[PDB]
Amino acid sequence: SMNFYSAYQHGFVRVAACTHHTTIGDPAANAASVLDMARACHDDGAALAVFPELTLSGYSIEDVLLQDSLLDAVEDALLDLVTESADLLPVLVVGAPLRHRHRIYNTAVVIHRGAVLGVVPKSYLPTYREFYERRQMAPGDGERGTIRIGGADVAFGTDLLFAASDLPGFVLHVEIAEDMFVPMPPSAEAALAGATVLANLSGSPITIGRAEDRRLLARSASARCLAAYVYAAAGEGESTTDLAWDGQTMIWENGALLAESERFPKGVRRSVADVDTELLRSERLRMGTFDDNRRHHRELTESFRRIDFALDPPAGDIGLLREVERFPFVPADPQRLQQD
Amino acid sequence: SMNFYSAYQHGFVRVAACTHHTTIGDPAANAASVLDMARACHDDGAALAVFPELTLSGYSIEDVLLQDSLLDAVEDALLDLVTESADLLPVLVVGAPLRHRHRIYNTAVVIHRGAVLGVVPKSYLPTYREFYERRQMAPGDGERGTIRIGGADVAFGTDLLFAASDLPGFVLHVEIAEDMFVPMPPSAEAALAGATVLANLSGSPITIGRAEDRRLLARSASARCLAAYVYAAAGEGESTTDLAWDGQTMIWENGALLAESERFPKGVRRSVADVDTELLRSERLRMGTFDDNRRHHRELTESFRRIDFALDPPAGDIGLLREVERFPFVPADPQRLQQDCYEAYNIQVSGLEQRLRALDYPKVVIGVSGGLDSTHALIVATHAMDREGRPRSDILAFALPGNNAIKLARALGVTFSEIDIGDTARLMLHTIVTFENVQAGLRTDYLFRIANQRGGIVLGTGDLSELALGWSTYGVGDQMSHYNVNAGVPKTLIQHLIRWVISAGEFGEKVGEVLQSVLDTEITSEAKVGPFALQDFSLFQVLRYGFRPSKIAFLAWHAWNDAERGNWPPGFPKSERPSYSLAEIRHWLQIFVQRFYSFSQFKRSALPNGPKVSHGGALSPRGDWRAPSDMSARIWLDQIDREVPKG
Amino acid sequence: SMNFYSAYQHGFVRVAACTHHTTIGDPAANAASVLDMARACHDDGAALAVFPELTLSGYSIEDVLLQDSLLDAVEDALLDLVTESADLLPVLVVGAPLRHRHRIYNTAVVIHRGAVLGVVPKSYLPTYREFYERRQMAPGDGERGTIRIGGADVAFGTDLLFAASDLPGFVLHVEIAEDMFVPMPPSAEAALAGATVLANLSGSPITIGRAEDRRLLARSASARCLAAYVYAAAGEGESTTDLAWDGQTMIWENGALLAESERFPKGVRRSVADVDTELLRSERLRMGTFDDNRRHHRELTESFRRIDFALDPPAGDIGLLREVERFPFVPADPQRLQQDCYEAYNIQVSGLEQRLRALDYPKVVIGVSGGLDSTHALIVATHAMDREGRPRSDILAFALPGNNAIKLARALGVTFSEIDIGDTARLMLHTIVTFENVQAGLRTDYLFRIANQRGGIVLGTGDLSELALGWSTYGVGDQMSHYNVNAGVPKTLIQHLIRWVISAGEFGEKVGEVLQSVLDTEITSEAKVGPFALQDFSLFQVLRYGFRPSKIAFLAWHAWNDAERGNWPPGFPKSERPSYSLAEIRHWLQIFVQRFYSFSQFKRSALPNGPKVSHGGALSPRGDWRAPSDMSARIWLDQIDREVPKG
Amino acid sequence: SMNFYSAYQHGFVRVAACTHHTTIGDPAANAASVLDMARACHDDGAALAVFPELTLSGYSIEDVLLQDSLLDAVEDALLDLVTESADLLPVLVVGAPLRHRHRIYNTAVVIHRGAVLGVVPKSYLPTYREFYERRQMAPGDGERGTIRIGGADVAFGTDLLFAASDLPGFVLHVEIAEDMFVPMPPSAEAALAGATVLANLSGSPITIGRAEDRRLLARSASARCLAAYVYAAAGEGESTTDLAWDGQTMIWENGALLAESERFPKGVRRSVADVDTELLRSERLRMGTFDDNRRHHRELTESFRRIDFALDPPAGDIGLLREVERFPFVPADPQRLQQD
């Protein structure tokens, strides 16, 4: 009775991390790259597409972030993407500098089927070495309430979960770049509150050793949080006035790398993989101390706001984008096998 | 006045992770193994010795934990170790099942100089797959107050810090096994509350893949918490009724492995390493978001109880138990170095690519001397052009006399031209080392003029080390260009990027032959400013950590004084492996702090665009290094006079 | 597509502070004065009309406040005004003593389009010297909930914001008289909670010095709260049994007075002004510590109740009720301008002094063309040398040909020399507008070479406006120097600094004669980049506020289109008072946004040291302006195409 | 029986705002300027001497603040000033970057008679336009507890009052630069909690119009807070890499300017004035709404920590450093009189 060949009917969720073509200070151009990639994700049957930090403006534009025409152009582009999403399958997570109360915030806008589900500000804004973020942007940690976007008040803050009502194994939480590098990252509290898929939008100028650092933190987040971790960094088009960019994207699940894309690519790239939500569910069912940790932090974890959406994923054979070892006890990789 | 050779006086703390010999269900025997190892740690001058989970009983004894004679014997053994510690230097962290209120707890007992400083219960007790811990033992999360041990009420709970009052960089926090594997580990809150050294006592039966899991979690804890992480697991002697044990111990610092011991050993083993508490302090000083995270969780972090102790560490020369790379920009490990070079090269190339696109593909004007820096920049320029689908003939390379350059340009197929500045110089020197700045300026003046005329931009080739020392003719000079791809690359790395390019072989064999000739000719300025190997060493310590000069000299002397110690990267024939005395390191360091802090900033203050390359830093005043152009280096020079011996 | 001439479509909000005719103890009469004034505000297109404290009863009536017929008559009058407001544009803020629970409160009733939005009680009731308020009225601090007015329960309390849902930059908060005089005024918490327009209804019997006190507190509120502050006090009609009244009204914005009315008037008066809500928004966007202060007081600020209303303001041309200076860097007011020039000059001089001390008094090499910029830099260099007790002959001034310069150098007693670059240029143009960059570069090349040779540094003379537009030969060029005292000074201010120096007369009459000759000769490049008066206008709006181009054109057109409107600074004979059409302003603005946002950043990215001068900003990439060197100005040009009429 | 000619016996307190000679990155040199000025204040019988922001390091040194030798040299210089103060009458308020927990803080160290009474961190660190403070330094708002200085744990935080136990009209509170420019400044809560003399250490690079801004905010603070306001800004010696400095000092009392010093001076300058603590006491006694405002914010104001010290001021004739109008109803100033 099930369609046996359907990855969605077996509890997989298809997810994409995307590095788009940045046109600094041109939100209509960044949005056209985003929409093109989002349509490719739709055609692939993906439930989620995550883009780099500050997608719509460019990450690297410094005081240009504060120019009224830049901020107006970001709003106009964002609303146009939102109207476009009416016809797209995946939840899109797109970065934007947005005005709220006194300041602009470094945000991820979570978009689905013609509506904005929520806006998530970055919690920790580095202002050291090559980073100057607190100069233009306000910290989002501890901010709640709603933000007004396109005539709607939508949820805003760093306590949001997006739960697929027809795919209970898929509960999304979003954080940005530096948020995963601090001792108590927002995603760790979100995992305990019920998030199974943790997204990270990053700008992340590339230096020697930095990719290893991203990997260490995203991999160990995915393991310690019994979760998938979907990471996208900015690439070609960001300003190289002082910095370079490698466009890295990667998808981790419980400590395993599911997919990653070409570093320093010419043109856009995506990592696309089927996350086994039942694997994550089975690990959390068995590891009781994971839930004891949630109970220890009950007040923190019980107060997240859960925003529901219906994914209505494709029901047919879309293949399976995942390496499935023939021998779960005998790793194909020779080095790994020697070690075992 | 300091004892310069003392690791403790330079802010190191010596720490040990120990796997003892387990005698299951025999606390007197486990304590005798512990005491023997603790005495070895004392003799080594260690400030801390951490042992495996449930040291005194054995981890693996299941319902035997609940037997009154087992628990009584644990108390008697524990008190006897405590009396023994009166005469031992290190804080000992020893595991024990201990009674408190209704239950036994899985505890770490923190012992120092004849007293128990605190007792820390495990917070999360796994009861799944091979673990059955909640059956015998109570969870410690959320428990506070005191526990009665040997006639004293001592602090008990999972909110304790142990702070050395005479070594402020050493603040200890303890957790146990599973505690580091949950999404919000106790050690992460303790790091934010002030812990710099995080200890983990583990039992951890070993299965395929488990060591990788321990490593992943301890390494990433140490990185995300800007801390040292000291881990010891149980080994021989634990019951093998259902399980095996590998006795692994390891010490991490900020993501780097400092030491680890033999897996599945015959006999006891220890990892022992000097943790740089100033490295941890410098990282936390700079990473402001670490403290923003503490402020977000203020209530959680402000309520830890701090228990003070005086370590009174050895003041003399006890060596340094730490690998100190000779080249902080050039990793000795070949695989790591290949990766670094791959990364630097693509940084440089993609930086320039973006500049070329934004300017609608100008011609690229570049001065080529045959030297390492300009050789490499021309290779970068070439690859950037290739990737952007642009003709190599749009590269305009100029020799400017006052060899390998023309060979290399011809082999690449770029446009090469040789202008002789001799004559224009002459008319200059008339209309107004002088001689030698007029030349440098006329080089630049020409390049810009040709760039104007030809619809192009000037690519710079000067390197980071030259920026650090102000080795450069300011103004109309070699600093000035439209885009400098070498600005972020220290001189010590340049030769390896060229070697990497040759190995790549992606340019073909003729070009590889010319690059090899450049290396052979150039490798064998440093007479005015000294060896770049020493000046790049100090640049990294200053730019990344802000270390004081005596600390830099001490690290440099340990790395450099004996050519036979430590490791050298690839590319150093035996004959090219210099060693430096302390007098030499001191001399070049005085020159370094004067040029860096005082003389050179004005020249950097107006730098051309170019990408940051090294995790150690670059020197863009728009970026990593904001500093005044008009400051004295008096206090750094004085620090050297006061604290670094003459030789 | 916007109506370009509409102040509301450019983010202004028109606001009115009104002093009505008081009839003490006669609410129907006070309401008829209020309604008459409110209709005048409506006709003016005002969004807000604020009246004096206790409008409907009279402020000064003491125990009459407690009479049932007075209080009943206040209710009847209030309800009748409310019905009247159905047909009026502005929110009305009208004072009334109103019963609530046990007592009467001193209230502001906020009325809009036929409904009461909220009732705000005074928080602090003075009972000292001439004030007896706690005798008749209850304090409102800490009161919340609702009050019953005309069959509706409406919000009551000192935690209310009134937010225009169709004009997000307009968020109103109301307080009364004494409320702004206490150390922690309610309006300061409301500003942090989101209020942008703060209203004050005052009774405020007038005594010697009191108007200065009101001004001090309202002005500093508006500045510290990055807000507009709209103040109205009672006047004729209040009882003069013991007290007099002056009817003062005033409107402040961020520390600037927008409007004020006649003191002690015969008849009613209003202040009416367009508040720039985008100016307030831009200041709050940039001043991050404003929001840090809100986060510190999160609990206090997050609990305000926001009451929404739709203003539906007039969409057409209603003029602009606001003084828009033609020269944002050159205040029209003579006293203010003298002060600015005094300040700029000492900034420049003391900046250079510190540089000279730190370098142990080098000689100072400077290119002098006779032009305004280099004339002024030479004066600064001279004064810096004098103050540091250094000989004027250590100044090495060079004319470099390819008049007033030699006169001025001779009159100052500095060392003057004239090198002709004609010849070196020639040999350059051979060995390789080209013509004209070779010259510029050879100037610089020489200056640096002489500085090297003579033990000196090169002082730059280029100005801020030249930096803004990238008017300059990059590299070896006129940007490059060791220290540029003019880097922070826009071209429009330069002439006034010279005039100020002449007026000072501290250099003696011969030097003053030469400076005057420079002004006369130079005043009467702008052909490529347009009038500096327009380009400095746009630079200020962009650098200080980030305003979009249509907003900048609108401000510039109001300032500049009619030479007879507004004020001109000193130093503009009638014949030198140009006016500009919108087509012209639009043209120079397209050139401005292209050069500023896109073309020019690379040249600034490597600037020499020099001090920031203007509160509007400087362009140091180490300072006020961090921006990419490789960005398009497409969106700004497109905004002009879409929103600014062709003429 | 009183010494009639003694300003201290009539309820005056003599206070000094000092601009010292900055030697950037040389704490021993800055401390020697400080000590010289502090001795002049002692000779003048001053009870208080306030110095510019970050006195011991230089305000303008940017990433040099983070160098271990700079920070060590600041500690050594600070301790040496502290030992010197054993023999000086005035409380000294000296700026220093100091390590505490993870970061350095921009601090005012309050020194009296050989001891440190307290260390007060700056609450709001501007990072906009010419200011980059959050890059090197941590915000002090909300920090409490103690800091370890020279073998003593002393009070640390932005809730400290220093009360002269033998001069009850003199209760000191300290804030730094930007702290007075925000809508709810720390000094306003301190005034309500009992502070009568509010000190501000400022760096404050000078631009056109900025002196008017300082004046507006310090004057109105002094008026609205029925207090004296003692302000000192940095001058000669700060780096002029991007900025200039004017060394302004000023003393306000209840809205009146008591003293101010030469702008852009050659050499050090001080403002020195006798503050009438009875004038401040009489205004607060009469203006009941001042205390109603404290009662409204009771929780905020009741929790300040009061640190006591004995001034033991000179008992003799030291003159009176204050303009006393012959005609309190007839201002001597012609413009002011025309207005009256």
Swiss-Prot record, chains B, C:
Gene3D superfamilies: Carbon-nitrogen hydrolase (3.60.110.10), Glutamine-dependent NAD+ synthetase, C-terminal domain (1.10.10.1140), HUPs (3.40.50.620). The keyword Repeat does not apply. One of its GO terms (biological process) is NAD biosynthetic process. This is Glutamine-dependent NAD(+) synthetase. ATP binds at G367, V368, S369, G370, G371, L372, D373, S374, T461. Keywords: ATP-binding, Ligase, NAD, Nucleotide-binding. In the C-terminal section; belongs to the NAD synthetase family. Residues 13-277 form the CN hydrolase domain. Residues 338-647 are annotated as: Ligase. It is an enzyme of class 6 (ligase).
